[PDB]
Amino acid sequence: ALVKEEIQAKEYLENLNKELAKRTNVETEAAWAYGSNITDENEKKKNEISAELAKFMKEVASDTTKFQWRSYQSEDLKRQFKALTKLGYAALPEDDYAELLDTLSAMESNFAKVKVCDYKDSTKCDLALDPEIEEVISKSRDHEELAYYWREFYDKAGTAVRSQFERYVELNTKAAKLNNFTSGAEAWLDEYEDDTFEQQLEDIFADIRPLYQQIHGYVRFRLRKHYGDAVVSETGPIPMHLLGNMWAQQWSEIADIVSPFPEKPLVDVSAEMEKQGYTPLKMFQMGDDFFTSMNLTKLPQDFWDKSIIEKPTDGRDLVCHASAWDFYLTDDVRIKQCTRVTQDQLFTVHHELGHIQYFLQYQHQPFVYRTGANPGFHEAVGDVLSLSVSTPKHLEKIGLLKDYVRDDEARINQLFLTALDKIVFLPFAFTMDKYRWSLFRGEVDKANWNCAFWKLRDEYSGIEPPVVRSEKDFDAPAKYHISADVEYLRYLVSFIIQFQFYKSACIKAGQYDPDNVELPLDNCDIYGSAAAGAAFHNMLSMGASKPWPDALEAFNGERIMSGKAIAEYFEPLRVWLEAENIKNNVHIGWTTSNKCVS
Ligand SMILES: *[C@@H]1O[C@H](CO)[C@@H](O[C@@H]2O[C@H](CO)[C@@H](O[C@@H]3O[C@H](CO[C@H]4O[C@H](CO)[C@@H](O)[C@H](O)[C@@H]4O)[C@@H](O)[C@H](O[C@H]4O[C@H](CO[C@@H]5O[C@H](CO)[C@@H](O)[C@H](O)[C@@H]5O)[C@@H](O)[C@H](O)[C@@H]4O)[C@@H]3O)[C@H](O)[C@H]2NC(C)=O)[C@H](O)[C@H]1NC(C)=O
Ligand SMILES: [Zn+2]
């Protein structure tokens, strides 16, 4: 009888979910120990426990065939069983899974251990990406110095790992096919539960792309005035080392030389943070305050007790790329961040605390539901708060921005600053997964892998390497997420939907009205808003219990991912920028790059 079996299945699921949570706790603890302290011993422990959990997952997936779950009445029960059938990498044979884990840790440890020699001191060779190299890329305006650090880092973080990356692609593909996906692309895309998801993103990207072109053109124009035409051409792709970021993913670090109105205020509170004696602890406490002010959950004692919020001062190797950790018990949540006292880092703190909040909000759910509605939702939470933190309105409240006059010109400066982070990022994010998808799908021959990467960066972002690269180089793994096997489409989704969340939260807070000149979207602060917090609670507490459109509906009554909100935010910038580019006869678009030899 199916009626009797469905009752037994419910009891089966409740026990199994609790078992999976407990087993994942053990794996997570070992993964935490390795990421905070990279050693051969900790790698071995992390990978051996993962192999053990994978073995158990195999048994679980096999056990689901004993239940007629597709025949059940409960949509909830069917959804849980469906989740249990999806093995991911755990579908691989024992030896293949062990090899993949060895390959993944080899790539992540390589990235984390990268050290370069000082440009001015060839005997000082202990400069790591975080913070040494990133500080130079963000602050130096010496184009040759920038080019040196670009080359040194990409050679060490990218090229050195080509063979491991090749084996990773092979095993990722094998795993996907064992789960009956065509490739790792489809495996990743399955997390969005929508068979038109790629086309939806193409459509949204196409709408925002013209604005990006205008920003690109104007920045290129302004860079030519700074560096001269020998360094930056009018018609070519922008040399990427000049954009204030190792991967040219976000350009806010060069705002001081590309700002629309240089005589008017440009928000950079890093100096005031230092002057007021800000610490990493204070920054996290302020983040905690923001969430609690919205009637959301305070950080538990375990967070403060166990988190790493500063780069360790011993000689040890660790992964410094910030991360949040759910240990699948009650209130055992942690962040690992190599925190610095800067404005950008203040946003990063809020980003990571967004993940933590999500963990706390759904910790009551069955294990399989203890994750985001889709990967983009998880990335978006903290960024919604960061948008309000970034406003002159909020920064004045916390005394970090002083003597600020919010006229038309200062507003354009602030909108442009935000766009250098939010619009510029969109083509970058798309290319990270367009690249990996093409490799996963077997669409690029191995002899063309490196120039396939730079071709996409050219086509979509209009940027290029500072020096000529070839198929002797392999540059993709120089980006953390590529070395660390972290899906990137989540960020494209996040940057779109975070404006849907922000707009709705702002309206709920009484902080945005499109017909009121005193309440513009770009100066909305949701701090202290219980109404905005209620929307977050309603959505986040769901976890992955329902398909993501239901989670969006719980927030604001909408069911569709839309670029309307992000375009609405930047509309006043679009009007000004289009006119400014025409006024200055600014060239738009770029010729095909010559910087990757086939
Ligand atoms: C990815 O896709 C794969 C297919 O491309 C898929 O692999 C298939 O999984 C099937 C299991 O669902 C499996 O089907 C079984 O086949 C057995 C014989 O297969 C042999 O010969 C094949 C060549 O003809 C070889 O290719 C194989 O290697 C094998 O050597 C059958 O003996 C078996 O049967 C039994 O089970 C059925 C199922 O019963 C179902 O459930 C209830 C049970 O209570 C039934 O009431 C209900 O009616 C329903 O049918 C019984 O009906 C039957 O009485 C037997 O007990 C079964 O059909 C198949 O072999 C396998 N490979 C191929 C090539 O087809 C993967 O599983 C997919 N992977 C994932 C992760 O989804
Ligand atoms: Zn994140």
- 25 and 328 Cβ atoms separated by less than 8 Å: yes
Distance, in Å, from the CA atom of 546 to the CA atom of 172, rounded to the nearest integer, reads 27
Ligand 1 centre and the CA of 338: distance in Å? 51
Q: Which residues pair with 325 in a beta bridge?
A: 334
Distance, in Å, from the CA atom of 355 to the CA atom of 348, rounded to the nearest integer, reads 11
Assess whether the C-beta atom of 179 lies below 6 angstroms from ligand 1: yes
- 217 and 586 Cβ atoms separated by less than 8 Å: yes
Is 481 an active-site residue? yes
3-class SS string, 491-558? HHHHHHHHHHHHHHHHHHCCCCCCCCCCCCHHHCCCCCCHHHHHHHHHHHCCCCCCCHHHHHHHHHCC
Phi/psi for 333 (5° steps) reads -130, 145
Long-range contacts: 35-41, Cβ < 8 Å, 24+? 35/318, 35/319, 35/323, 35/336, 36/308, 36/312, 36/318, 36/319, 36/336, 37/316, 37/317, 37/318, 38/109, 38/112, 38/113, 38/316, 38/317, 38/318, 38/319, 39/317
Phi/psi for 440 (5° steps) reads -60, -40
Q: Which residues pair with 526 in a beta bridge?
A: none
Distance, in Å, from the CA atom of 238 to the CA atom of 277, rounded to the nearest integer, reads 38
Distance, in Å, from the CA atom of 274 to the CA atom of 279, rounded to the nearest integer, reads 8
Kindly state the tokens that stand for 4.
Answer: 């009797």
Burial tier of 258 (Cβ tally within 10 Å: 0-12, 13-18, 19+): buried
Question: Which residues lie below 8 Å from residue 73, measured CB to CB, with a gap of 6+?
Answer: 6
Assess whether the C-beta atom of 70 lies below 6 angstroms from ligand 1: no
Q: Specify the experimental method.
A: X-ray
- 133 and 201 Cβ atoms separated by less than 8 Å: no
Phi/psi for 236 (5° steps) reads -90, 170
Long-range contacts: 227-231, Cβ < 8 Å, 24+? 227/143, 231/143
Task: Give how far Cα 229 sits from Cα of 221, 224, 586, Å.
Answer: 10, 6, 14
Identity of the residue numbered 549: P
Ligand 1 centre and the CA of 91: distance in Å? 17
CA angle 113-119-121, nearest 5°? 95
| Ligand 1 atom nearest residue 87's Cα | 71
Which of 48, 47, 60 lies closest to 21, judged by CA? 60
Kindly state the tokens that stand for 545.
Answer: 């219990």
Helix, strand, coil: what percent of the chain each, to 5?
65, 5, 30
Kindly state the tokens that stand for 488.
Answer: 């990137």
Assess whether the C-beta atom of 181 lies below 6 angstroms from ligand 1: no
Burial tier of 517 (Cβ tally within 10 Å: 0-12, 13-18, 19+): exposed
Report CA 103 to chain centroid distance, whole Å.
23
* 106 backbone φψ class: left, alpha, beta (φ>0; ψ -120 to 50): alpha
* Torsion sign (Cα): 295, 296, 299, 301: positive
Q: Is 351 annotated as a binding residue?
A: yes
Residue nearest to atom 46 of ligand 1 (CA): 68
Kindly state the tokens that stand for 367.
Answer: 């294990």
Assess whether the C-beta atom of 418 lies below 6 angstroms from ligand 1: no
- 386 and 351 Cβ atoms separated by less than 8 Å: yes
Ligand 2 centre and the CA of 500: distance in Å? 18
Ligand 1 centre and the CA of 50: distance in Å? 29
Kindly state the tokens that stand for 468.
Answer: 């000529």
Please state at what angle helix 425-440 crosses helix 489-508, rounded to 10 degrees.
140
Kindly state the tokens that stand for 185.
Answer: 């692309």
Long-range contacts: 58-67, Cβ < 8 Å, 24+? 58/87, 58/90, 58/91, 60/16, 60/20, 60/84, 61/85, 61/87, 61/90, 61/91, 67/5, 67/9, 67/12
Assess whether the C-beta atom of 180 lies below 6 angstroms from ligand 1: yes
Identity of the residue numbered 494: S
Q: To the nearest 10°, the Cα dihedral for 157, 162, 164, 170? A: 130
Residue 277 CB neighbour total at 10 angstroms: 8
Ligand 2 centre and the CA of 494: distance in Å? 9
CA angle 268-499-574, nearest 5°? 70
Catalytic residue among 352, 378, 394, 464: 352
Residue among 72, 180, 190 whose CB has most ligand 1 atoms within 8 A, to mutate? 180
Kindly state the tokens that stand for 514.
Answer: 């499109």
Residue nearest to atom 71 of ligand 1 (CA): 179
Assess whether the C-beta atom of 545 lies below 6 angstroms from ligand 1: no
Identity of the residue numbered 164: Q
Tell me the residue length of the chain. Answer: 598
Q: Which ligand is nearest to the CA of 495?
A: 2
Assess whether the C-beta atom of 585 lies below 6 angstroms from ligand 1: no
